[PDB]
Amino acid sequence: ELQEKLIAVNRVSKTVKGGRIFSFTALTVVGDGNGRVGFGYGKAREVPAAIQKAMEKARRNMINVALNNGTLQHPVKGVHTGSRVFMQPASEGTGIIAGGAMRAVLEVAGVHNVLAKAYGSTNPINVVRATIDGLENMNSPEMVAAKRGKSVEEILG
Amino acid sequence: KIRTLQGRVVSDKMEKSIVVAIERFVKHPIYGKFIKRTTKLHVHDENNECGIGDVVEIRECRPLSKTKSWTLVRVVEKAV
Amino acid sequence: ARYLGPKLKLSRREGTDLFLKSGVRAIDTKCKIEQAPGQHGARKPRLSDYGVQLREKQKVRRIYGVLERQFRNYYKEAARLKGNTGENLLALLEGRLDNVVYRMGFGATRAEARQLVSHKAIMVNGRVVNIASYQVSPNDVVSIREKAKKQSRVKAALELAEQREKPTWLEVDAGKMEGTFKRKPERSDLSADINEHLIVELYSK
Amino acid sequence: ATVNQLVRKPRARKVAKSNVPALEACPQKRGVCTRVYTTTPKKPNSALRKVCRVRLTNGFEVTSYIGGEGHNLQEHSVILIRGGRVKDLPGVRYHTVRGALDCSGVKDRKQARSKYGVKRP
Amino acid sequence: MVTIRLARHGAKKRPFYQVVVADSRNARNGRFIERVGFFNPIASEKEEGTRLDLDRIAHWVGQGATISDRVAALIKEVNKAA
Amino acid sequence: SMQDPIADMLTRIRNGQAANKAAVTMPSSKLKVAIANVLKEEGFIEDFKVEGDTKPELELTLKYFQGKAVVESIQRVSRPGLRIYKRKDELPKVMAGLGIAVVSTSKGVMTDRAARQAGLGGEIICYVA
RNA sequence: UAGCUAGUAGGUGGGGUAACGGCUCACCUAGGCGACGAUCCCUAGCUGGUCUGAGAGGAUGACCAGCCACACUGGAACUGA
RNA sequence: CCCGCAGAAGAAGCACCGGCUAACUCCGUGCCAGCAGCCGCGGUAAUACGGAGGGUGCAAGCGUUAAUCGGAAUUACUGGGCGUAAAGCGCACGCAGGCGGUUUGUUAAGUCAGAUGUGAAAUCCCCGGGCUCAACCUGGGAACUGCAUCUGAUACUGGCAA
Ligand SMILES: [Mg+2]
Ligand SMILES: [Mg+2]
Ligand SMILES: [Mg+2]
Ligand SMILES: [Mg+2]
Ligand SMILES: [Mg+2]
Ligand SMILES: [Mg+2]
Ligand SMILES: [Mg+2]
Ligand SMILES: [Mg+2]
Ligand SMILES: [Mg+2]
Ligand SMILES: [Mg+2]
Ligand SMILES: [Mg+2]
Ligand SMILES: [Mg+2]
Ligand SMILES: [Mg+2]
Ligand SMILES: [Mg+2]
Ligand SMILES: [Mg+2]
Ligand SMILES: [Mg+2]
Ligand SMILES: [Mg+2]
Ligand SMILES: [Mg+2]
Ligand SMILES: [Mg+2]
Ligand SMILES: [Mg+2]
Ligand SMILES: [Mg+2]
Ligand SMILES: [Mg+2]
Ligand SMILES: [Mg+2]
Ligand SMILES: [Mg+2]
Ligand SMILES: [Mg+2]
Ligand SMILES: [Mg+2]
Ligand SMILES: [Mg+2]
Ligand SMILES: [Mg+2]
Ligand SMILES: [Mg+2]
Ligand SMILES: [Mg+2]
Ligand SMILES: [Mg+2]
Ligand SMILES: [Mg+2]
Ligand SMILES: [Mg+2]
Ligand SMILES: [Mg+2]
Ligand SMILES: [Mg+2]
Ligand SMILES: [Mg+2]
Ligand SMILES: [Mg+2]
Ligand SMILES: [Mg+2]
Ligand SMILES: [Mg+2]
Ligand SMILES: [Mg+2]
Ligand SMILES: [Mg+2]
Ligand SMILES: [Mg+2]
Ligand SMILES: [Mg+2]
Ligand SMILES: [Mg+2]
Ligand SMILES: [Mg+2]
Ligand SMILES: [Mg+2]
Ligand SMILES: [Mg+2]
Ligand SMILES: [Mg+2]
Ligand SMILES: [Mg+2]
Ligand SMILES: [Mg+2]
Ligand SMILES: [Mg+2]
Ligand SMILES: [Mg+2]
Ligand SMILES: [Mg+2]
Ligand SMILES: [Mg+2]
Ligand SMILES: [Mg+2]
Ligand SMILES: [Mg+2]
Ligand SMILES: [Mg+2]
Ligand SMILES: [Mg+2]
Ligand SMILES: [Mg+2]
Ligand SMILES: [Mg+2]
Ligand SMILES: [Mg+2]
Ligand SMILES: [Mg+2]
Ligand SMILES: [Mg+2]
Ligand SMILES: [Mg+2]
Ligand SMILES: [Mg+2]
Ligand SMILES: [Mg+2]
Ligand SMILES: [Mg+2]
Ligand SMILES: [Mg+2]
């Protein structure tokens, strides 16, 4: 269950006695397409080596997401650094209407149709963490039922 | 019933006429906060019945001057 | 109003076979398909996220023979209609008369079907229709008029339609050039290759 | 901030000034033209950029850039002005429309000829 | 004088008349009290052609309203027992 | 200087849950008990009392399911600086109807779910996720 | 733009108005408006709507429809429902 | 609107092709000539200038200009901030104003519920119908987020007595 993909690649510099040496930073997200997501950063001297190094981290750094059918449970914020991020569940129609970086993480997670918007800064690294902070936080009705110790139907209905 | 309006008097020093503020607690269109807005009418009264600083009931009627289309109905709670 | 240029050129740029120059012969093998869009055909494209959406839109346009102004109007109808926006886009395209006339087998190509519709040959529910864009409603009976019936272009073009998949949603008589459009086309019946999701993405932004 | 403060003084909307004072939302405007001349641009560029002062019909006195290679503009000659900064000559914030009125088309042009006002070959 | 007359809407060469209760001084298309059915001369034999709410006509003609030359013909067209 | 007492209650609940604290003492009231009972009845709080005659001290007893606290988020909506009264149909639903909004209606204080079915609106006191 | 205001603010009586009224007079009282923006200045026909927007809003008020205003510029009345 | 000939005959442009943004080479020129919506291209091997070929995008239109909103959560009510980025008055007192601990009353101003009248027609929206189709016209519905009055509800906020 791969469904791996690349959000952004970006070259970064160091500067030393001689001149300045350039490495590359990848940013990949992976998921099964059924409530499992994992971003992995990864950096290296060469570009294709950086994306493997990222993909290896992305597989291990995985988070579970309890989601309804093919969409979110409830509207959710998920702040991180300078990226606010908001995303609403939406109905069985439509598709993923969200920004790049924010919609790579959503489509591989397995949400088929959501509203979304990145406020604040839209740095690819931080907006991907912002989403995963949101999707980790996002609780389901089965969790909330057991949390209070009441009933699944009495809460929902 | 007759369409009256309650209100507190601001002044009565005009001879057979009285000015009355109607405090209306409407909310702000944009910002949602409830503001304490005022409406100063001129009102007719037979003799100097009502003084300064007291609640008064007022009715809409015929225009009887330049301004002053409202008219007194009765007094409720006199001046302190 | 129409393309009227090199039609097999459009298929190499897109990659897949668009049925533009399907015609009498079954398979082409006469253009270096896939690996020669133009002069710089050997150039492997990077192909961005906006690219793949545009390539998918332009494919569905060039197959059905529709321009962007009229195509974007189908999207505006598709959004307002019920169900799924993606499934409606393609359902409205398949409901065109020039497309139905092609799918019945009264035209080797869709452009030939378009010309057949436009030149007073096609007739539906006892009424002549010139418009390729004519939205064919459920439960109709498209047919050819008796003056232009059994002309040289239609009889040869109907023999081609035996090799074709032949839709389930419509039925053809084949003897007297008489068709019967029955129900609205389903997603799973046709194509199973052109992606709708990417075209919905292009227009939503 | 503070909802009471906003009731007392509402949100003042930033009235962003227009780039091009040609006035009354006009697409283009006539210009009598005075002093056709060359000028040097800012730092990384270096050239002799062709430009003219334009006595506009409404009363304004603006510089306008003369696009294309070569021109018929001199001393007077009535021209048409559209909007658009050059971003190189500081002060120049308009473009002469090539083709309209006494400003002729660019000589011997093939590609992009609506811009530069040239007819078919 | 209130009068029941046609309003004339629809496209060029394709008229559609909104029969309507209006004051004589007000323009054809302009101000009215209330619309009271319609008329379509280019309808032909099909489902719909002409409709005219006869209950509201009793409220106006009974009180004091004239009926125009064409609207008087459509009250004869709709009939009382035909 | 102590303008909203109800917000102060909801901070003590929020800040008690952050500190992993068992019980939360505070000055009592009519409206405090009404809110505290609605939170208990649905199941954010696990029991409470109102011990005191002259100077009453309402103490709550906060709930914890895992290491995580039960009250995820709790905020004042209809603060005294800006009163927020919603109508029957315009009543909110917190977390798409799996959290609650405490709403002071004409038939006493109750949840937003109960206010819909009872058929009336009111002052929305606080959202509770 | 911080004070404006003397038929100005109210009363009694007379005249006038299709109609009530400082509408207008005579006398009487000394008010009235004003920081929840009077006065002064600049700009502007107003609405149903239009365009835009996830919506809140923002902008706008060509065409169709309602209301107002004006008719060479400044006045006045006559005629008449 | 319908047939009747006639012959492909009379009927295709114009943006763009360095990143943003779909599409590349070759000559000419050499911080010149010029381009430019933003970054920026040109100093003798230019994908950005001029031409040529080739492509891409729209097509009886296409681009440029101007104008409004959007994106702009860049006036933030929904929905921002103020240690160092722009931003806590130098510090107090204080009238008007905003806000106000707690328990009983009691009204019903706010608030909430219901009901009736109205919110012109068109427009918008949905299901139809009519022009060969569409735009266009058009039937009915919903809506017109409102305002008024009238009857209740008393938790909350206000008024009022302790
Ligand atoms: Mg060292
Ligand atoms: Mg920013
Ligand atoms: Mg009453
Ligand atoms: Mg009342
Ligand atoms: Mg056209
Ligand atoms: Mg050919
Ligand atoms: Mg959109
Ligand atoms: Mg220089
Ligand atoms: Mg009139
Ligand atoms: Mg007839
Ligand atoms: Mg209501
Ligand atoms: Mg008269
Ligand atoms: Mg008067
Ligand atoms: Mg809209
Ligand atoms: Mg929109
Ligand atoms: Mg917005
Ligand atoms: Mg306006
Ligand atoms: Mg006009
Ligand atoms: Mg006209
Ligand atoms: Mg007119
Ligand atoms: Mg009037
Ligand atoms: Mg008037
Ligand atoms: Mg006049
Ligand atoms: Mg007049
Ligand atoms: Mg005139
Ligand atoms: Mg005159
Ligand atoms: Mg005159
Ligand atoms: Mg005059
Ligand atoms: Mg007479
Ligand atoms: Mg003909
Ligand atoms: Mg012929
Ligand atoms: Mg021939
Ligand atoms: Mg022949
Ligand atoms: Mg030709
Ligand atoms: Mg030189
Ligand atoms: Mg070089
Ligand atoms: Mg070269
Ligand atoms: Mg070029
Ligand atoms: Mg070309
Ligand atoms: Mg244009
Ligand atoms: Mg803007
Ligand atoms: Mg904004
Ligand atoms: Mg705010
Ligand atoms: Mg900020
Ligand atoms: Mg500094
Ligand atoms: Mg600072
Ligand atoms: Mg300070
Ligand atoms: Mg200080
Ligand atoms: Mg200050
Ligand atoms: Mg005070
Ligand atoms: Mg107070
Ligand atoms: Mg209190
Ligand atoms: Mg209290
Ligand atoms: Mg009572
Ligand atoms: Mg009330
Ligand atoms: Mg009210
Ligand atoms: Mg009500
Ligand atoms: Mg209406
Ligand atoms: Mg329709
Ligand atoms: Mg039809
Ligand atoms: Mg139809
Ligand atoms: Mg229309
Ligand atoms: Mg209609
Ligand atoms: Mg209607
Ligand atoms: Mg209704
Ligand atoms: Mg009681
Ligand atoms: Mg009470
Ligand atoms: Mg009370």
Side-chain angles (χ1 to χ4, degrees), chain D residues 3 74 84 92 121:
Chain D
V3 72
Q74 54 175 29
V92 180

mmCIF file of all heavy atoms in Angstrom, chain D residues 3 74 84 92 121:
data_model
loop_
_atom_site.group_PDB
_atom_site.id
_atom_site.type_symbol
_atom_site.label_atom_id
_atom_site.label_comp_id
_atom_site.label_asym_id
_atom_site.label_seq_id
_atom_site.Cartn_x
_atom_site.Cartn_y
_atom_site.Cartn_z
ATOM 1 N N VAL D 3 -14.815 44.871 19.941
ATOM 2 C CA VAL D 3 -16.051 45.123 19.195
ATOM 3 C C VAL D 3 -16.674 46.498 19.486
ATOM 4 O O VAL D 3 -17.299 47.089 18.608
ATOM 5 C CB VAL D 3 -17.083 43.992 19.432
ATOM 6 C CG1 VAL D 3 -17.681 44.057 20.837
ATOM 7 C CG2 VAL D 3 -18.177 44.024 18.374
ATOM 8 N N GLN D 74 7.499 63.219 -33.819
ATOM 9 C CA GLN D 74 8.413 64.361 -33.769
ATOM 10 C C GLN D 74 7.670 65.651 -33.433
ATOM 11 O O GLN D 74 6.545 65.849 -33.894
ATOM 12 C CB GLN D 74 9.147 64.524 -35.108
ATOM 13 C CG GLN D 74 8.242 64.622 -36.334
ATOM 14 C CD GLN D 74 9.007 64.913 -37.615
ATOM 15 O OE1 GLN D 74 10.175 64.544 -37.755
ATOM 16 N NE2 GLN D 74 8.347 65.574 -38.564
ATOM 17 N N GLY D 84 0.081 51.360 -18.893
ATOM 18 C CA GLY D 84 1.125 50.345 -18.761
ATOM 19 C C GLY D 84 2.461 50.977 -18.445
ATOM 20 O O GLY D 84 2.979 51.760 -19.242
ATOM 21 N N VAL D 92 8.054 57.210 -16.368
ATOM 22 C CA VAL D 92 7.268 56.806 -17.535
ATOM 23 C C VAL D 92 6.276 55.746 -17.085
ATOM 24 O O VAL D 92 6.679 54.696 -16.580
ATOM 25 C CB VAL D 92 8.150 56.241 -18.670
ATOM 26 C CG1 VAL D 92 7.293 55.827 -19.864
ATOM 27 C CG2 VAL D 92 9.203 57.262 -19.095
ATOM 28 N N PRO D 121 1.150 40.734 -44.399
ATOM 29 C CA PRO D 121 2.067 40.810 -45.535
ATOM 30 C C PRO D 121 1.367 40.500 -46.862
ATOM 31 O O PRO D 121 0.524 39.602 -46.924
ATOM 32 C CB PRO D 121 3.113 39.742 -45.205
ATOM 33 C CG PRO D 121 2.362 38.720 -44.427
ATOM 34 C CD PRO D 121 1.315 39.470 -43.651
#
